[PDB]
Amino acid sequence: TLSKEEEVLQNLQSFSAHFKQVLKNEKPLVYYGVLKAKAPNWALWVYEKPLKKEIYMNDKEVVVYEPNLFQATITPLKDKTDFFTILKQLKKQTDGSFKTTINKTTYRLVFKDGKPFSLEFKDDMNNLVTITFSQAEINPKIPNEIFVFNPKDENIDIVRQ
């Protein structure tokens, strides 16, 4: 009664992948990085190119660290919308994609060769965000400390918005 993709989501406890992030508008400026996610609701997005940014996320908040600025911006989250939460919520659609809606934003996951392949949603400006995964790993061992925002030094301005 579970498809192969449905079993992956049921059994999933961690995930890592390289990603390409495209936002559709004037000219596609494409961001590249690495994603690590882990139960219960932890996620880390490391952008490597062309800008370096680290986005730590859990159930309660998101931390956006901009090393070029020596600044971290913290936003409390009212809805659980981290990557692992979304996956554990997806339901299979008639077209074979997977979807879920959280706070009026619909997220669409497509699989390929048995692994998460792409994630698509509108941002809060109604712009379409497409994230494509490569070198995807199902249930890798990801050490917990990777997820701890450790400045590490203390030049960092902490901005709350």
Numbering used by the authors: 24 to 184
The authors write:
After X-ray diffraction data were collected, the structure of LolA-HP was determined with molecular replacement using a search model obtained from AlphaFold. The structure was refined to 2.05 Å with final Rwork and Rfree values of 20.2 and 25.2%, respectively. Similar to other LolA structures, LolA-HP comprises a curved antiparallel β-sheet that consists of 12 strands. The last strand, β12, links to β11 through an elongated segment that extends along the outwardly curved surface of the β-sheet. The concave side of the sheet forms a hydrophobic cleft, shielded from the adjacent solvent by the presence of a helix (α2) and an extended loop region between β6 and α2. The base of this cleft is formed by the N-terminal helix, α1. In LolA-EC and other studied LolA structures, there is an additional helix that protects the cleft, which is equivalent to the extended β6α3 loop in LolA-HP. In LolA-HP there is a proline (P99) at the end of β6 that precedes the extended region, but no other prolines are present in the segment that fills the cleft. In LolA-HP, this motif is replaced by an Ala-Pro motif (Ala62, Pro63), and the space that would be occupied by the arginine side chain in LolA-EC is instead filled by a phenylalanine side chain (Phe107) on the α3-helix. Structural comparisons showed that LolA-HP has a deeper hydrophobic cleft but lacks the negative electrostatic potential critical for binding polymyxins.
